[model samples]
Target: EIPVIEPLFTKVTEDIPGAEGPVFDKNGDFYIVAPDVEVNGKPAGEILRIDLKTGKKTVICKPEVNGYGGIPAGCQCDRDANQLFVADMRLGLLVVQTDGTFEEIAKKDSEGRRMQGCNDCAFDYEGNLWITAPAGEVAPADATASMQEKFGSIYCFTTDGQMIQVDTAFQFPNGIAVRHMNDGRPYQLIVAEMPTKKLWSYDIKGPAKIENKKVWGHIPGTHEGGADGMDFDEDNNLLVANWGSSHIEVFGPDGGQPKMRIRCPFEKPSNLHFKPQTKTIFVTEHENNAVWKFEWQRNGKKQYCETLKFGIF
Candidate 1:
């Protein structure tokens, strides 16, 4: 029997529209992305900082690239420099400081092909950045391109400043997480594909060297949306944001059936993140354009950003 966890804090509001990318910096300030903040008839994505104490949202910076605003989908803060590593959908990847300065890193792969789009990212123990480039947003002539498009891939940005295209031809690669063994060795890299609600896995052999692809597990979905974002707990359970199902599905590392189904306040939850080392959870929802706060049964696994302060090569 799967357990359902209800939200402790939720509000019905449109104050923060297009809510996504729930993350926490080293200073403990909560940050999330408002990816479609319209400015001058264009989607200029702005990074917002939220104070959980007073429920106040402040605009930190709006990162732009290629003569347009960036669509940053996910973020992770490196401990040493405490800068936000943004996996942007429109302008590739970027590193943003809190004071508004940022550097756009890699747009084209090693072979010089323009990236499809960056959706989510994860860091290994070696501080190697693993990213999911699923889309770059397109003009709608038919149906919304979420399920219709097939130009999706996985990428890795090494600490040595090299971008490698790992694999290609995915339905819609959304959420991502990296697993580390108790001995501090990176084990598996897991990605959540949207259309099928499936969690795919690739065993990590070395830096950007993944092999033996496996269909790890999948959640139940009988509707339009599928998986979007995911994270791993200290106990090694994977929690997924079920976009259409209104729940965050939890499965063990073995990855078969979910042991818990976390209920969200909104109908469509885009992503979720754990607050530092605690069991406290913050979730980004698209339906209400709001963030939800709650608690969990297990603490979060220590991430690479925190473990490797300077990043390993």
Candidate 2:
């Protein structure tokens, strides 16, 4: 059974309004993105890296694409290529390099139309990138009523520099993940639609085939906001951050029922990430301008809990 959930907030960073993405690198360090913020006296998006051991936070650099500010949203480290991928709202998509420079990915669809508001991304075992973009620049007031109009989409990016639209007409599609199933099962893609408050799943058949689309989960309340960035635990259970409700809910592997829920101290808990090796979970709050950390207790043993004070925004 999962241990009693206890989340402790640490005032690490501030002044970032929509802190959407929080991810961990190979060295056990944590990184998160702050969109539409000023850096170096100019308007640019920033990615902050935090050291776990010393609790030091550093601004890596401002990500840019096509000589424009990236306005980055969600981010993930690609361990195979030793690079990090970020979804930029204005710049489409970008890949961050070791020198803090960024390379813009494909920005246009098959018809040569420019893509807008690339929200989040995830990579499968085969290295294909899956991305989510809301339907239009202006979101409708009633997302539930606009579901049939193809308002948002899910896209697949090939290693050979091709973008394929796999699904369409979602309501403010927000967080996304491509994770393995149970020990021997195949991998699948999971997407969180924020406004509609629902989760969708798709099977990764091949580079050109993503099939078996289905609704996997849904937010229970009639809250204004829905799910954001999410990740799976060691048991393949999904941990989702409800930005509208300021809480995290864990769902079993089958996605049938919610196994646990942990509320946050503040509202708008935008994103969450987990490090299995350290059994540590990091969460970001959009409205509160804070990030929190907690350890998964296995046997109810008391552990060290101290607040680390710092700033880099």
Candidate 3:
């Protein structure tokens, strides 16, 4: 049986409103954001720092992160450098400074049409940011999208700000994770499709005929709960957070089949990270307002527990 630890609350509604954007730095410290606050009668997101070991919370950055607001989402670190990227849904993409100052990068929507509410983004080894187009419940959303067709998709942008449409037409595309093969090419993209309870895998560098294809998986009730953010385990197993499912879905690295589905002790499990530094799995939940931790061992062994006292900070 998979074991579960308690939940950690670094802060909550009493302090920080809606805690989102749980990203891990190389130093093992997790950076999060509180976007549930309404300022000037508008929602402005606040970035917070959480010290995992001590349950300490610090408001690192607030409102107008590079000049924008709304639910601050999508964060990724450039593996080759210290630079990090945040896809501020309200502010566009912001470049983070070592001193924690967020600078504007690409704020204009793709093709300069209209901002689709850029959601999640990932930086490849070569420093290209692959992001999903504005998705989910948007204000005055389209009826076709609301009906749950291929409403949202993925977009790839070079460091120079050139945009490429990667995936076209889909259900709500949520958080995404990419894996590079030994060839130094992006070989996999695991996308969480919340509406249909689907986890999709694409062979990112295959033949043109095979690109943008969908290889997917699901749990028994995933359609009901909806899957959220995802990442890879130590062994490269896909670890998925079920936003509505309130559980985790583990799939083989090949994206061939389901391997494990572990439930969290929270209500809405949002995003997750596999910290190589501590061999631990960090799972964040928006509903429970907590971040759950698990020590990963050989042979698929996980000793789960609540490591921090979190309240959406």
Candidate 4:
């Protein structure tokens, strides 16, 4: 039998607000966030812990602030602490524990520059987190993104309790992930710029020390809703979620174009994450309000969690 997009979870709603943050923790448990789910008649984002086998769904937390539950756009698991890192579009970066408790880690960098709201996050082999804040100039009533002030920033929240602003003035930085060598040493910090549909690269010299910026590759597609989330395969290929294009474009190592495309059954594929050390990948799409899963040819690159088990340091 040929493979297909197997939807793991689908939410039935009129608006079909969809889901994001498809992540698997060190314990191999899958988690996702429905950013538009209601709680007490209000939009309180639901952090769900999903059982892949029994199809059981557990609401881990309904995170809210300022009378509105923030949009949990991205997620990455902490292998060392066994916690979940949420990149909230409005609530900043949050740390969610197994007991459903959460804390806002930072809304601003250590230098006092307030983050305009985070879009995505990733953990490097060093256990440090990299996040993207794309809404710095996103005015609620503004129609033209190109006319708005470009203040998007990328941050590296270190394990040592420092939220460092690594880059600024990005025209909507969305997805982020680290590419490591065979020895588990991270080499480049890759970020997705949504408007241009381009992936940018930064040389990772040390923890929270990323340098040299250049256009790494172009996410093939037209118009807006560009690359949203990204993950690396063990062969050093990047699987980028092309939001408006209804597909995931797989780009080979250091290549400028897509090597192949995985079709999505929805409009906006928000994000994607691979099961640690496996070829299985979970995809989150907006138009269908669901989490989809499929298999790939190569295993995903050794994530921070896997490196931790084999001595990351």
Candidate 5:
């Protein structure tokens, strides 16, 4: 059944333009990417932190790291809660420590095995980082120039600097997540293919190496909004930010297809993240320059949740 979605709050405005991915930290604060580029004399591409209490946006770090890197486009803090793993498009993979220290973990571009454009990324159970490069040739903004020749792919990397490319047949693969199932097996790599408008899954079930990948779910109308950033809910269902369609798509653990889709009254919905402690889904819209928070509930049982908002435990 499709549950009703209400906007709990608008955490962002035009003040922070070009908002992209949104991820909540352990402290109940939210991290959002505002990708700007000298709009009327303003700078571009900032990772903003939203204070849970004050509801104010603070600049934690820019493209240039204190001693490590530069130009981070897509990033996520791992479940370890001690560091941030950034898909620094300009600097490659960067490990940002909690004490404001960071280092370049991996960055390379050889002739045949090169990462053209690195965007969204996620970490799996074994501390492996997986990232996506949407544009196969140039970039996403250069989308109209016949972009369907080669395939866009997602790369898997371990903390130890090992890398693997999973060519699962996609055109502009964007957001991806890894959730370890309780079956005592290996983790699952869930990738969102934007241009193809579908979601893919791989078992990654080999010891010391990942293999036997599979397609977990597929959804139609992806061409409608273009699937972008995605995350898993508490129940392990996939939450997708349907880019052009202005909606959020949800799928059951093994639904094979989209079980439900929540439409938002905005545009360019890039990132969708579920905050477990708060039971809240942070949805960011790039064109509207807004981030909408919605309360998530399963049955008619309401958490009574604070008001138009609640605190993340």
Candidate 6:
């Protein structure tokens, strides 16, 4: 059964339209991308920061490359350097600075071919970046039935700028989340395939190697836009944003059971994030141009739970 979670706080924004990929910076502020914005008759992408305490929204910076708007999608961080890694749909992986300026790390693979559909990304315990770069010439909106197969792939990018294709069997791999297990020695990568309405998991062997593929979870019926992005809570639960289903489902640590399902006010939830400090989860609805925040309710004080040091508590 699906349980409904009501939002304690919700903020609707028209300034940052088409919001996606919410990440927390070291300063405790939350950053999410507004990628579908156009400025001066040209494509422009804005990164907006939400103040955790006051719930204020501010534009950190606008990133652009090669006369193409940033077109930023998924975002992660190298906390040590305080830099952000954003996957730009039109451009490749971008290393963004604190001031909002960025540089394209890699646009073409080893074979010198441009990367297509570089969607989302995640980071492992070792600081290695796992990116989902599905193959296809057209955008997801324009993708036809013929463009569904043998084109999608997942790549592991190293700090030194080497990109390796680890997985190639996917129709449209959208979101990815990585975390270590209880033992702390083994970690896993979870990928959400949009076309098949399925989630896949892989055992990370090393920085650039992954094996032991398995099906983690499955969605019934067909979601028009399929699954988009996801993240793991401190409790080891996986929260997935079902793009067209108007809901986000939470899976257990084993990644097999749906523990909870929270219905969204609008459809097409692009991504979600858990704010550790605030003990609240933020969900971005792309179509609605809004962001929702949920927290545990109490009389005068809200409860903020701490996550385990490792997967085990």
Q: How many residue pairs clash in each candidate?
A: 0, 2, 18, 1, 5, 0
Where does the lowest 10-residue lDDT sum fall in candidate 4?
138-147
Residue 42, candidate 1: Cα error in Å is 1.6
Q: Give lDDT tens digits, candidate 1, residues 1-313.
A: 6777675655522467778888888888788988868788776888888888777888887877656677778887776777888887777788989897898886578888765567788888887889988774321111123456676888999988888989877888889999988876888999888987688999999889899998998777787788888888998899898997988899987998888888876789898888888988788888878888788887988766567544355
Worst 10 residues of 5 by lDDT: 299-308
Per-residue error (Å), model 4, residue 295: 1.3
Candidate 5: lDDT of 135?
Answer: 44
In the predicted model 4, the residue pairs found to clash are 18-289
Q: What's the TM-score of each model vs. the native?
A: 0.92, 0.82, 0.78, 0.87, 0.77, 0.84
Model 4: per-residue Cα lDDT at residue 127: 85
Using lDDT, give the best candidate's number: 1
| Model 3 deviation from the true structure expressed as Cα RMSD, one decimal place | 7.4
For residues 1-313, could you state the per-residue lDDT of candidate 6 as single tens digits? 5566756456644445778878866655578888778888655767777766665788777766555566677888664676788876656678887786777786667667656656789877666788886644322222222126757778888756687778776887889988676544437889988878889998888887788899988754475776778877666677788888887877878877567777777777888777655557777887777777766321111111122224354
Question: Lowest summed-lDDT stretch of 10 residues in model 1?
Answer: 137-146
> Cα lDDT of all candidates, in order?
0.80, 0.68, 0.59, 0.78, 0.61, 0.71
lDDT of 5 at 166: 55
Best TM-score among the predictions, by candidate number: 1
Off by over 4 Å in 2: 1-4, 38-43, 53-56, 135-150, 181-186, 297-313
Residue pairs with backbone atoms closer than 3 Å in model 1 (clashes): none
The better candidate by TM-score, 1 or 6, is 1
Regions more than 4 Å wrong, model 6? 7-9, 12-14, 39-42, 52-56, 135-150, 296-313
Which residue runs of candidate 1 sit more than 4 Å off their true CA positions? Answer: 10-14, 136-146, 308-313
Candidate 3 structure quality by residue, lDDT tens digits, 94-198: 667456676666544456643444567765544567776544433233212322667585767675666555665667777777676643456776767677776
